[PDB]
Write a protein that binds this ligand. Structure first.
Ligand code: HEM
Ligand SMILES: OC(Cn1cncn1)(Cn1cncn1)c1ccc(F)cc1F
Length: 391
């Protein structure tokens, strides 16, 4: 059986995706747990799966379900956004994680420029992952959640294990989770926390209307959104920076015309290889997908770069084009029921980070050969451990 994932490299799509997409856009594969799954790799079939609610995210956590990887969190964390809705906490979460919050844009700006000024002061080479993108992501999310900036680095520490993509259960993941939860639970009891998502969650927790809502859930929300948001924005910006560095005339164009930076980031999103695995769903019924009858109880993996590099939807898919007619129609944020609630913020993080970097380091380039980057393995994202650059 063809094994997944194909490659841990986040800088280059494997040739085998284009071949697999045309001939077998749904194809049986084996996951690292040894489970069988259906890998879907065309825009047509990927959208089908994500729009069909009978292909369930929640049910991937069912006992004895075939698994893409080992659970690193309680089985109910996989249903976090549903739980959030059922508790009536939805539009509050959404309010907290909008990039439009007064002062947030300028905070991101000033934070980005300050990180860059420190790198320019220290001298090249600079590691843009550990000393720019990830610290930017972490700073942002502390702001968003209303927790102290100095607390960011320690919560960040859990993510190299929390977002592993493991064949086997991970002892450390439970230890870290319990500790982070305990942390968030204290944050909720802290009267000084009056801003951001945790400032809100804290005041809803006092109101007896929300007596039905557990303390586990409130604290879980904080841990979940921090980790998910920090890993995704930090990881996406890092590999987006590589794509940009490798396209000097695009780098030059955006530096000259910063108004095109949103169009550039949308393209960088479309071609991004940050998700290491397809998005998993469990079929809750027998459902036809292309030439395959997917059976109740079976795992399906939605390969985002399958869809995103599909020439049937995106002409010249390997090329970054700033004048595409339907540019936001990629699947980098998913589709349907579980479309990323952080997508607006994820955009602005990348847009502002890139704008800062292009202005401070207009001559940015890799300071090592591309084949020297060390790609993290058995992780839910594809990222280089370090991104050395000069300017
Ligand atoms: C460039 C940045 C980001 C990317 C590429 C990204 C990607 C994704 C994708 C592909 C999904 C759908 C997963 C699926 O359907 O199985 C998703 C869902 C989700 N994202 Fe993001 N995300 C990003 C930023 C963020 C941020 C900033 C946050 C929170 C602050 C966040 C929180 C979430 C949550 C809670 C879900 C689950 C939604 C649900 O189940 O209804 N993401 N994200
Ligand atoms: O954070 C996850 C996964 N995820 C991150 N982006 C898109 N999906 C769960 N997770 C898996 N390993 C560690 N954490 C998550 C977050 C919220 C949610 F509602 C579901 C969900 F699977």
């Amino acid at each position: 059986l063809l094994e997944v994932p194909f490659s841990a490299r986040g800088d280059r799509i494997p040739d085998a995706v284009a071949e697999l997409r045309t001939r077998e856009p749904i194809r049986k594969v084996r996951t690292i747990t040894g489970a069988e799954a259906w890998l879907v790799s065309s825009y047509a079939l990927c959208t089908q799966v994500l729009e069909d609610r009978r292909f369930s995210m929640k049910e991937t956590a069912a006992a004895g379900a075939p698994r893409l990887n080992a659970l690193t969190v309680p089985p109910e964390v996989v249903n976090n956004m549903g739980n959030i809705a059922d508790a009536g906490l939805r539009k509050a979460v959404m309010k907290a994680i909008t990039p439009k919050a007064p002062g947030l844009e300028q905070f991101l700006r000033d934070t980005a420029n300050s990180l860059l000024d420190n790198l320019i002061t220290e001298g090249a080479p600079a590691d843009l992952r550990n000393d720019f993108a990830d610290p930017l992501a972490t700073a942002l999310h502390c702001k968003v959640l209303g927790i102290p900036q100095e607390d960011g680095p320690k919560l960040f520490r859990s993510l190299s294990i929390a977002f592993m993509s493991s064949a086997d259960p991970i002892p450390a993941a439970k230890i870290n989770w319990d500790r982070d939860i305990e942390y968030m639970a204290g944050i909720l009891e802290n009267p000084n926390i009056t801003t951001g998502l945790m400032g809100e969650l804290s005041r809803l927790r006092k109101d007896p209307a929300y007596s039905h809502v557990s303390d586990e859930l409130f604290a879980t929300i904080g841990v979940t959104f921090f980790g998910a948001g920090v890993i995704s924005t930090g990881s996406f910006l890092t590999t987006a920076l590589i794509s940009l560095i490798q396209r000097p005339q695009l780098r030059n164009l955006l530096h000259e015309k910063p108004e095109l930076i949103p169009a550039g980031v949308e393209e960088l999103l479309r071609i991004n290889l940050s998700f290491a695995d397809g998005l998993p769903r469990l079929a809750t019924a027998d459902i036809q997908v292309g030439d395959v009858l997917v059976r109740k109880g079976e795992l399906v993996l939605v390969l985002l770069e399958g869809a995103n590099f599909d020439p049937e939807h995106f002409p010249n898919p390997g090329s970054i084009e700033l004048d595409r007619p339907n540019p936001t129609s990629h699947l980098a944020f998913g589709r349907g029921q579980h479309f990323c609630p952080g997508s607006a913020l994820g955009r602005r993080h990348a847009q502002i980070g890139i704008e800062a970097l292009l202005k401070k380091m207009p001559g940015v380039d890799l300071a090592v050969p591309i084949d020297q980057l060390v790609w993290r393995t058995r992780f839910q994202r594809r990222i280089p451990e370090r991104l050395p650059v000069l300017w």
